Amino acid sequence: QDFVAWLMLADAELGMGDTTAGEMAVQRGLALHPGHPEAVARLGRVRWTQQRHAEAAVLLQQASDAAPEHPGIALWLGHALEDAGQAEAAAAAYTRAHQLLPEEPYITAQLLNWRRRLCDWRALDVLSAQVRAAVAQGVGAVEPFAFLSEDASAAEQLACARTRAQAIAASVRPLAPTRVRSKGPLRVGFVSNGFGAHPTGLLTVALFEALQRRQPDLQMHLFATSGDDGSTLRTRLAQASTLHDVTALGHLATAKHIRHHGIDLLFDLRGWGGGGRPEVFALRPAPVQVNWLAYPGTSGAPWMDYVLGDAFALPPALEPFYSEHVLRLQGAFQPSDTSRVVAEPPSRTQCGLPEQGVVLCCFNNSYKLNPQSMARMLAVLREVPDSVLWLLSGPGEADARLRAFAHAQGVDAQRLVFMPKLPHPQYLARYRHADLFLDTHPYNAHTTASDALWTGCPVLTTPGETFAARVAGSLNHHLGLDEMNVADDAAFVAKAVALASDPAALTALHARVDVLRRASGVFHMDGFADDFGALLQALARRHGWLG
Ligand SMILES: [Pr+3]
Ligand SMILES: [Pr+3]
């Protein structure tokens, strides 16, 4: 008979992740107080939990109409709206949660992250300060990955990661410890949700193919937390490795499965570092666990032993800000899919571009396009009459917001051209119309910069003071294109303006990229497989391995 006892239990069971118990419990609440916004909100949260997002959004909107002053309801509504594809409506929901409970950092940091994704820069500096103060206060309430978008030092990034990671570790009893095998093929595991048409699969696919034919004494095992999406990438990854389907298993079941296969070296390619539900790692299923590639910064985590970088992106100066022990490959830390044919795209006119203007390109995630990166790009357009800025179309009204900013910055908004979303092969052919790629700060282009360079387009960047701000720089360095890493925004603008107004010099720079992309080691994955493989053998030899 206890209505509130029912729901609270509802939430309890859902917290566990327990399915039908939580719902059963909700069903009993609504029978006692029909329409009640708490029960109703809760039934929406069940649905969202059952991943029925549209039904989830319907229920929560109802609840939210019946209790519009309630901050938790407003938050949960934002969660469902987001997962239902309703981006702008998601934003209004978070905005209202935040207004109602500004005291709550978790909500503040959700709002901020979603605002950046929409290019909505209202209260940007204020929300950003609050999030940075929450890190300093040691709560663990901001997500490490979302934190990479802020311009904060390597030291703050470490504080954010380790406070989050230690929150997890405190509530996980690891598995009993094991050790690297002494004899037999080395088993090297990689855990990811991006084994498919996602950056992780895309970057590593040709590497795994090279390791297969070149490193006999090593077995690559992929543990895929997502199902087969039908992409060529997922299929090439499964033929090049032993690919285990661990999708929809709990964290304990997954850890037990990795331990059952005797994984010696386990790589976190999940993309979340110490955040995003890394309890498979906190359980320590593998004797040696390594952070590489998918998250560009430190895990801060007591369960992570090594991080894999390179001399440019992770120089000696930056080492103390990593909780992991630092290992370095001999060239760039980042592989790429050097099997890819670049098609001829349709004409410039067919892609929405002037045929006769300089096209500056910044294909990047929307949350990377902040006021600083945009202002410096628009400063190039003001100095160079016939140039245009080519961007990826963003979620919500992000493009409309960028047009307004361009207008407010003295630039005709029709000079921004937005590419819609295309399958990878079609997206990649577009680079053939790009004259210069303009990198962002402080979170660089990662896959989009190696896509640009593979197609022969030069990348301009200002290497900064965190790993995530040095990724594009590292590519240039290892390619041999050091003059395209410049000091600061003012040199960024002068180099771009000089290049954009000297088409003969820019032509000569495209010629240089062409030669360097063949003569450097950046796009030889056989060489990358030899280095990576040798480094794997030494890490293991070092913990007991004997071949
Ligand atoms: Pr052509
Ligand atoms: Pr051209």
Side-chain angles (χ1 to χ4, degrees), residues 484-500:
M484 297 302 289
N485 295 334
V486 298
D488 67 10
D489 282 3
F492 183 94
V493 176
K495 184 47 110 119
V497 176
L499 284 177

PDB file of all heavy atoms in Angstrom, residues 484-500:
ATOM      1  N   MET A 484      53.523  23.561 -40.453  1.00  0.00           N
ATOM      2  CA  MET A 484      52.064  23.650 -40.356  1.00  0.00           C
ATOM      3  C   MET A 484      51.600  23.524 -38.880  1.00  0.00           C
ATOM      4  O   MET A 484      50.418  23.567 -38.598  1.00  0.00           O
ATOM      5  CB  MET A 484      51.414  22.588 -41.237  1.00  0.00           C
ATOM      6  CG  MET A 484      51.715  22.764 -42.764  1.00  0.00           C
ATOM      7  SD  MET A 484      51.177  24.386 -43.377  1.00  0.00           S
ATOM      8  CE  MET A 484      49.405  24.101 -43.286  1.00  0.00           C
ATOM      9  N   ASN A 485      52.552  23.341 -37.957  1.00  0.00           N
ATOM     10  CA  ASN A 485      52.283  23.513 -36.535  1.00  0.00           C
ATOM     11  C   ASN A 485      52.807  24.892 -36.173  1.00  0.00           C
ATOM     12  O   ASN A 485      54.023  25.127 -36.227  1.00  0.00           O
ATOM     13  CB  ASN A 485      53.028  22.481 -35.704  1.00  0.00           C
ATOM     14  CG  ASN A 485      52.552  21.075 -35.977  1.00  0.00           C
ATOM     15  OD1 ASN A 485      51.406  20.872 -36.396  1.00  0.00           O
ATOM     16  ND2 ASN A 485      53.410  20.087 -35.695  1.00  0.00           N
ATOM     17  N   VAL A 486      51.909  25.804 -35.825  1.00  0.00           N
ATOM     18  CA  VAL A 486      52.316  27.166 -35.539  1.00  0.00           C
ATOM     19  C   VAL A 486      52.045  27.504 -34.084  1.00  0.00           C
ATOM     20  O   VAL A 486      51.397  26.731 -33.358  1.00  0.00           O
ATOM     21  CB  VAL A 486      51.650  28.167 -36.502  1.00  0.00           C
ATOM     22  CG1 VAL A 486      52.072  27.871 -37.952  1.00  0.00           C
ATOM     23  CG2 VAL A 486      50.131  28.100 -36.374  1.00  0.00           C
ATOM     24  N   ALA A 487      52.566  28.658 -33.660  1.00  0.00           N
ATOM     25  CA  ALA A 487      52.677  29.021 -32.257  1.00  0.00           C
ATOM     26  C   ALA A 487      51.354  29.331 -31.548  1.00  0.00           C
ATOM     27  O   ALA A 487      51.154  28.926 -30.417  1.00  0.00           O
ATOM     28  CB  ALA A 487      53.652  30.226 -32.107  1.00  0.00           C
ATOM     29  N   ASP A 488      50.456  30.073 -32.177  1.00  0.00           N
ATOM     30  CA  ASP A 488      49.316  30.613 -31.449  1.00  0.00           C
ATOM     31  C   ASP A 488      48.333  31.189 -32.455  1.00  0.00           C
ATOM     32  O   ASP A 488      48.599  31.158 -33.646  1.00  0.00           O
ATOM     33  CB  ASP A 488      49.782  31.684 -30.443  1.00  0.00           C
ATOM     34  CG  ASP A 488      50.332  32.938 -31.117  1.00  0.00           C
ATOM     35  OD1 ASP A 488      50.206  33.103 -32.344  1.00  0.00           O
ATOM     36  OD2 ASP A 488      50.896  33.797 -30.416  1.00  0.00           O
ATOM     37  N   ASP A 489      47.202  31.715 -31.979  1.00  0.00           N
ATOM     38  CA  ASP A 489      46.114  32.102 -32.877  1.00  0.00           C
ATOM     39  C   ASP A 489      46.559  33.126 -33.922  1.00  0.00           C
ATOM     40  O   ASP A 489      46.182  33.038 -35.085  1.00  0.00           O
ATOM     41  CB  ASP A 489      44.927  32.673 -32.094  1.00  0.00           C
ATOM     42  CG  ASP A 489      44.059  31.590 -31.426  1.00  0.00           C
ATOM     43  OD1 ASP A 489      44.402  30.364 -31.520  1.00  0.00           O
ATOM     44  OD2 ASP A 489      43.023  31.988 -30.811  1.00  0.00           O
ATOM     45  N   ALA A 490      47.342  34.111 -33.505  1.00  0.00           N
ATOM     46  CA  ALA A 490      47.792  35.137 -34.427  1.00  0.00           C
ATOM     47  C   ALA A 490      48.643  34.543 -35.544  1.00  0.00           C
ATOM     48  O   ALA A 490      48.485  34.934 -36.670  1.00  0.00           O
ATOM     49  CB  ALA A 490      48.536  36.238 -33.708  1.00  0.00           C
ATOM     50  N   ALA A 491      49.526  33.595 -35.248  1.00  0.00           N
ATOM     51  CA  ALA A 491      50.296  32.940 -36.313  1.00  0.00           C
ATOM     52  C   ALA A 491      49.416  31.987 -37.115  1.00  0.00           C
ATOM     53  O   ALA A 491      49.630  31.777 -38.307  1.00  0.00           O
ATOM     54  CB  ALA A 491      51.473  32.183 -35.732  1.00  0.00           C
ATOM     55  N   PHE A 492      48.454  31.362 -36.442  1.00  0.00           N
ATOM     56  CA  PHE A 492      47.456  30.563 -37.141  1.00  0.00           C
ATOM     57  C   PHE A 492      46.814  31.415 -38.247  1.00  0.00           C
ATOM     58  O   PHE A 492      46.782  31.019 -39.431  1.00  0.00           O
ATOM     59  CB  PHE A 492      46.419  30.035 -36.146  1.00  0.00           C
ATOM     60  CG  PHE A 492      45.353  29.132 -36.754  1.00  0.00           C
ATOM     61  CD1 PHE A 492      45.516  27.744 -36.757  1.00  0.00           C
ATOM     62  CD2 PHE A 492      44.155  29.667 -37.262  1.00  0.00           C
ATOM     63  CE1 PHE A 492      44.524  26.893 -37.275  1.00  0.00           C
ATOM     64  CE2 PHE A 492      43.167  28.814 -37.787  1.00  0.00           C
ATOM     65  CZ  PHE A 492      43.357  27.435 -37.786  1.00  0.00           C
ATOM     66  N   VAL A 493      46.337  32.600 -37.889  1.00  0.00           N
ATOM     67  CA  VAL A 493      45.648  33.425 -38.866  1.00  0.00           C
ATOM     68  C   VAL A 493      46.584  33.891 -39.974  1.00  0.00           C
ATOM     69  O   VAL A 493      46.217  33.881 -41.135  1.00  0.00           O
ATOM     70  CB  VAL A 493      44.939  34.616 -38.213  1.00  0.00           C
ATOM     71  CG1 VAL A 493      44.313  35.519 -39.278  1.00  0.00           C
ATOM     72  CG2 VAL A 493      43.880  34.102 -37.226  1.00  0.00           C
ATOM     73  N   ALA A 494      47.796  34.303 -39.635  1.00  0.00           N
ATOM     74  CA  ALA A 494      48.691  34.798 -40.672  1.00  0.00           C
ATOM     75  C   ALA A 494      49.094  33.701 -41.666  1.00  0.00           C
ATOM     76  O   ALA A 494      49.262  33.966 -42.850  1.00  0.00           O
ATOM     77  CB  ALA A 494      49.919  35.449 -40.065  1.00  0.00           C
ATOM     78  N   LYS A 495      49.298  32.487 -41.192  1.00  0.00           N
ATOM     79  CA  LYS A 495      49.718  31.396 -42.092  1.00  0.00           C
ATOM     80  C   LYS A 495      48.580  31.064 -43.071  1.00  0.00           C
ATOM     81  O   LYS A 495      48.788  30.916 -44.284  1.00  0.00           O
ATOM     82  CB  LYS A 495      50.148  30.158 -41.261  1.00  0.00           C
ATOM     83  CG  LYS A 495      50.712  28.986 -42.083  1.00  0.00           C
ATOM     84  CD  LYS A 495      51.739  29.477 -43.106  1.00  0.00           C
ATOM     85  CE  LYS A 495      53.152  29.037 -42.748  1.00  0.00           C
ATOM     86  NZ  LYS A 495      53.753  28.163 -43.809  1.00  0.00           N
ATOM     87  N   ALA A 496      47.359  30.972 -42.533  1.00  0.00           N
ATOM     88  CA  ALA A 496      46.161  30.650 -43.327  1.00  0.00           C
ATOM     89  C   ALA A 496      45.872  31.741 -44.372  1.00  0.00           C
ATOM     90  O   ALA A 496      45.602  31.458 -45.544  1.00  0.00           O
ATOM     91  CB  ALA A 496      44.942  30.432 -42.387  1.00  0.00           C
ATOM     92  N   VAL A 497      45.980  32.998 -43.960  1.00  0.00           N
ATOM     93  CA  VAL A 497      45.792  34.100 -44.887  1.00  0.00           C
ATOM     94  C   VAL A 497      46.866  34.124 -45.968  1.00  0.00           C
ATOM     95  O   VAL A 497      46.572  34.364 -47.152  1.00  0.00           O
ATOM     96  CB  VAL A 497      45.685  35.440 -44.126  1.00  0.00           C
ATOM     97  CG1 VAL A 497      45.587  36.603 -45.074  1.00  0.00           C
ATOM     98  CG2 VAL A 497      44.463  35.393 -43.246  1.00  0.00           C
ATOM     99  N   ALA A 498      48.107  33.847 -45.587  1.00  0.00           N
ATOM    100  CA  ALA A 498      49.184  33.831 -46.591  1.00  0.00           C
ATOM    101  C   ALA A 498      48.972  32.709 -47.593  1.00  0.00           C
ATOM    102  O   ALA A 498      49.158  32.911 -48.789  1.00  0.00           O
ATOM    103  CB  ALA A 498      50.573  33.713 -45.933  1.00  0.00           C
ATOM    104  N   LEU A 499      48.578  31.530 -47.095  1.00  0.00           N
ATOM    105  CA  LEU A 499      48.312  30.371 -47.954  1.00  0.00           C
ATOM    106  C   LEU A 499      47.092  30.629 -48.820  1.00  0.00           C
ATOM    107  O   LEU A 499      47.130  30.406 -50.016  1.00  0.00           O
ATOM    108  CB  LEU A 499      48.102  29.090 -47.131  1.00  0.00           C
ATOM    109  CG  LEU A 499      49.388  28.481 -46.585  1.00  0.00           C
ATOM    110  CD1 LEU A 499      49.098  27.260 -45.734  1.00  0.00           C
ATOM    111  CD2 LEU A 499      50.317  28.139 -47.741  1.00  0.00           C
ATOM    112  N   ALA A 500      46.014  31.115 -48.217  1.00  0.00           N
ATOM    113  CA  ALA A 500      44.799  31.367 -48.995  1.00  0.00           C
ATOM    114  C   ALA A 500      44.962  32.461 -50.066  1.00  0.00           C
ATOM    115  O   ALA A 500      44.285  32.448 -51.087  1.00  0.00           O
ATOM    116  CB  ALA A 500      43.609  31.644 -48.072  1.00  0.00           C
TER     117      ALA A 500
END
